[PDB]
Amino acid sequence: EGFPFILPKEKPNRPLSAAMQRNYDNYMAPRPENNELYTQFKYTELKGFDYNGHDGTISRRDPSKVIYENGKYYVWYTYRNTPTPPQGAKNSNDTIPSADWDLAEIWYATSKDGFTWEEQGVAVPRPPKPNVGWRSVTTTDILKWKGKFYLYYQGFMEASGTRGDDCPVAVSYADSPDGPWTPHTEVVIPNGKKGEWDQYSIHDPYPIVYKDKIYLYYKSDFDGDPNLVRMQGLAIADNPLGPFKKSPLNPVINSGHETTLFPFKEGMAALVIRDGTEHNTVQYAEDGVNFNIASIVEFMPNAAGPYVADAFTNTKYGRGISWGISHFTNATTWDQNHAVLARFDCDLSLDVDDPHMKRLGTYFKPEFYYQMGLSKKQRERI
Amino acid sequence: QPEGFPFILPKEKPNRPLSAAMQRNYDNYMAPRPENNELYTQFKYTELKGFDYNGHDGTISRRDPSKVIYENGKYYVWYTYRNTPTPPQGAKNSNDTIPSADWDLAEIWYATSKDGFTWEEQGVAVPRPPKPNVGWRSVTTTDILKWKGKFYLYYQGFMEASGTRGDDCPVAVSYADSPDGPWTPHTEVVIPNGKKGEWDQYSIHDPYPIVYKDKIYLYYKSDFDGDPNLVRMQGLAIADNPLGPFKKSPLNPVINSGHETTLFPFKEGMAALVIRDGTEHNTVQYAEDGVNFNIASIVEFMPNAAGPYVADAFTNTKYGRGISWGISHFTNATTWDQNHAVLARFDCDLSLDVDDPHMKRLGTYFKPEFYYQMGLSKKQRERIE
Numbered sequence: 001e002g003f004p005f006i007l008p009k010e011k012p013n014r015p016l017s018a019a020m021q022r023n024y025d026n027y028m029a030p031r032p033e034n035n036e037l038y039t040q041f042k043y044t045e046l047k048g049f050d051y052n053g054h055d056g057t058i059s060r061r062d063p064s065k066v067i068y069e070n071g072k073y074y075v076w077y078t079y080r081n082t083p084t085p086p087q088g089a090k091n092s093n094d095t096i097p098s099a100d101w102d103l104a105e106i107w108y109a110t111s112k113d114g115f116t117w118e119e120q121g122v123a124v125p126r127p128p129k130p131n132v133g134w135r136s137v138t139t140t141d142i143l144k145w146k147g148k149f150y151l152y153y154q155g156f157m158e159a160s161g162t163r164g165d166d167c168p169v170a171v172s173y174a175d176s177p178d179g180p181w182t183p184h185t186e187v188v189i190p191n192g193k194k195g196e197w198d199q200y201s202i203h204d205p206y207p208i209v210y211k212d213k214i215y216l217y218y219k220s221d222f223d224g225d226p227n228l229v230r231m232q233g234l235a236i237a238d239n240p241l242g243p244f245k246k247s248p249l250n251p252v253i254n255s256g257h258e259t260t261l262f263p264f265k266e267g268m269a270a271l272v273i274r275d276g277t278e279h280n281t282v283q284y285a286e287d288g289v290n291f292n293i294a295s296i297v298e299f300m301p302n303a304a305g306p307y308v309a310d311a312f313t314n315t316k317y318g319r320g321i322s323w324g325i326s327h328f329t330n331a332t333t334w335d336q337n338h339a340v341l342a343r344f345d346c347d348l349s350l351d352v353d354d355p356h357m358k359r360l361g362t363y364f365k366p367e368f369y370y371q372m373g374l375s376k377k378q379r380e381r382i
Numbered sequence: 383q384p385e386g387f388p389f390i391l392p393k394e395k396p397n398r399p400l401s402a403a404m405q406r407n408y409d410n411y412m413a414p415r416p417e418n419n420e421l422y423t424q425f426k427y428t429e430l431k432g433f434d435y436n437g438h439d440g441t442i443s444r445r446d447p448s449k450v451i452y453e454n455g456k457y458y459v460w461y462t463y464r465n466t467p468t469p470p471q472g473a474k475n476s477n478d479t480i481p482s483a484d485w486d487l488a489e490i491w492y493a494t495s496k497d498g499f500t501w502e503e504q505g506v507a508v509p510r511p512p513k514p515n516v517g518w519r520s521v522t523t524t525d526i527l528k529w530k531g532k533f534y535l536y537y538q539g540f541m542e543a544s545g546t547r548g549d550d551c552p553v554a555v556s557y558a559d560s561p562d563g564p565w566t567p568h569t570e571v572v573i574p575n576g577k578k579g580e581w582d583q584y585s586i587h588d589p590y591p592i593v594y595k596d597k598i599y600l601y602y603k604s605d606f607d608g609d610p611n612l613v614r615m616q617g618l619a620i621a622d623n624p625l626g627p628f629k630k631s632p633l634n635p636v637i638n639s640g641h642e643t644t645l646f647p648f649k650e651g652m653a654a655l656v657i658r659d660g661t662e663h664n665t666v667q668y669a670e671d672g673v674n675f676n677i678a679s680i681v682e683f684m685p686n687a688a689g690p691y692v693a694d695a696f697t698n699t700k701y702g703r704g705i706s707w708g709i710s711h712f713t714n715a716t717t718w719d720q721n722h723a724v725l726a727r728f729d730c731d732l733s734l735d736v737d738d739p740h741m742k743r744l745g746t747y748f749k750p751e752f753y754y755q756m757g758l759s760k761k762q763r764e765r766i767e
């Protein structure tokens with residue numbers, strides 16, 4: 001009569017509470033150990049990147065997916081090297097950046113093992129004014145299509161923060177992952193119309209080959225009262241230079257920030273990080289459009305660029321991920337504002353089985369918790 | 383080119399085609415954003431003043447606080463209190479004086495405070511009865527109930543040292559006319575174990591009562607399964623009388639995750655902190671009826687084994703207010719060879735009567751060196767290639 005002591009692998013045929021029904025109906029397994037989309041994340045400090053003594057003049061952030069070509073791993077990222085660290089839009093000009101990603105280029109690095117990288121230099125330079133991206137080219141991601149390579153990126157036309165963090169998405173292309181990279185110059189993912197959620201920002205472009213097409217996911221900042229809202233959308237294309245057609249169901253993900261996705265089984269998995277009600281989840285859509293919570297996780301990577309071996313193969317059954325590159329922002333202090341690249345490792349893979357990536361949390365000593373203390377105003381409130 | 387979702391986030395679900403995730407954003411939560419979600423919060427921690435732990439050498443441990451209550455112009459809290467010649471040594475090395483585990487050879491002590499930051503430790507509330515009475519080995523993991531002007535503490539009573547054969551710890555109740563005690567033990571079964579083969583057959587842990595729907599709704603946790611690991615879920619049992627016996631919900635488990643139970647009335651329903659383990663760890667959940675719980679928010683750095691101050695815990699409220707502070711614990715506060723736990727204070731906004739945007743940021747983030755401490759093992763590096 002009572003619920004069994006041995007946890008059933010399949011939903012028992014008995015009256016069940018709403019929470020028990022959900023444990024079976026909503027997740028790939030009724031326990032974390034067998035949930036292929038539950039994981040912990042481990043972090044490794046990269047070697048190979050110089051940040052000018054971390055004085056805020058050099059930043060690297062928002063890595064592309066990692067790919068493997070020419071016997072090595074490649075990664076692209078936002079690279080800012082300015083004499084002055086970021087000063088905010090009001091105090092920016094042609095040489096002083098507004099935000100960490102202002103006045104930036106796309107650079108690239110290679111690696112034999114994903115732990116030590118060698119910086120190769122510029123991939124996408126800033127185009128001349130007034131072309132899309134002249135102010136800053138940022139937040140790129142990579143697609144391979146019919147033997148050629150495409151870097152989609154945010155293309156700033158005014159310093160970030162002038163009205164908001166505003167831009168459309170542009171693209172460059174190459175015959176080799178070593179470049180050189182030719183700009184498409186036209187906008188490829190446009191802003192929405194007046195009054196639409198994506199009218200000011202198309203951020204974090206992230207393409208995956210799926211269902212014979214290019215599924216490119218992005219984020220947009222909207223609302224503003226009381227605060228900005230961030231959600232994620234989708235646009236789909238038959239050719240890498242477009243036309244991209246936005247899903248009529250955007251936003252497809254109701255939380256998160258920077259997009260990170262990968263083919264998984266017949267569907268698409270997504271990391272849903274930092275913001276929104278469903279922050280700190282991995283999510284899954286059977287069709288790449290209708291996303292559900294697949295797991296609840298902690299210490300997620302920021303702006304992950306995983307190694308997705310099956311990102312471009314038009315796979316009919318995605319295997320998932322186990323490592324990549326991510327970032328940490330404001331690595332020192334705000335007056336020397338800059339980001340660093342980092343490595344993460346996890347098990348969101350059908351081809352990796354490591355119970356030591358599947359513990360339920362990471363815990364700390366009391367002193368750590370006391371640092372998340374009450375302010376002066378809070379203690380005064382009582 | 384399709385007509386787009388609007389720039390201003392609507393307060394109610396708009397009448398337009400929506401993705402499954404946008405539908406859920408409106409359908410499943412109390413609000414379509416964290417700022418207006420009364421069950422979303424952060425947690426802030428404050429070091430308590432008043433408790434000595436023998437220089438943190440592991441001989442003294444305090445853990446599993448009760449709900450905090452207000453009586454006689456002051457705040458009371460009860461907790462597990464261990465004071466032994468040696469720290470815990472494991473099941474194999476335990477004896478009459480040597481504890482096997484942090485909660486072994488312990489009693490229920492209590493403390494009082496004018497403010498909830500400095501505590502005056504009053505001493506024993508529930509002593510270990512003489513063997514072979516329920517709890518002779520250790521009395522632990524208590525929670526408080528006020529019922530028709532009297533007080534009741536529910537607690538685990540160990541029958542042998544944790545980790546040795548015969549270490550059952552059934553729930554016992556003691557009662558008093560004053561929160562100061564003295565406390566009289568009741569020596570009847572309060573919440574029975576499940577029948578053989580059932581999820582709660584060996585364990586009724588972390589008892590936690592709330593007055594609700596004219597009755598006592600007592601939530602607890604059970605350890606079950608075991609292969610590959612134990613599974614923890616939470617159940618409900620209800621009584622007409624504080625002495626019990628309590629009758630189990632036929633829908634147990636009512637919460638599919640979590641660990642130690644912590645709950646509070648909220649609106650016409652009941653909210654719960656779902657901590658550490660299970661698929662739905664790190665959530666606040668809500669049940670309109672106290673039985674059918676849904677995820678209300680996802681949160682981080684949740685308190686362990688929280689005992690909130692729940693002003694309306696006992697008043698049979700028809701609309702609960704929620705919580706904003708209480709006591710919780712930290713385990714293995716120093717090192718394992720000196721194993722002990724400490725009591726801490728937590729503050730939050732899970733309250734209809736508190737509105738603090740500085741309790742409602744979406745995360746707490748650190749410098750790179752913090753994350754590099756969560757690195758790979760040599761074994762993982764070798765595997766990875």
Ligand SMILES: O[C@H]1[C@H]2OC[C@@H]1O[C@H](O)[C@H]2O
Binds near residue numbers: 101154258
């Ligand atoms: O424009 C934004 C985009 O790239 C830089 C800015 O912040 C994040 O990492 C991304 O959402």
Ligand SMILES: [Ca+2]
Binds near residue numbers: 064139141
């Ligand atoms: Ca990105």
Ligand SMILES: [Ca+2]
Binds near residue numbers: 347349350353
């Ligand atoms: Ca796996």
Ligand SMILES: [Ca+2]
Binds near residue numbers: 523524642643687
């Ligand atoms: Ca408790």
Ligand SMILES: [Ca+2]
Binds near residue numbers: 420731732734735
């Ligand atoms: Ca509130």
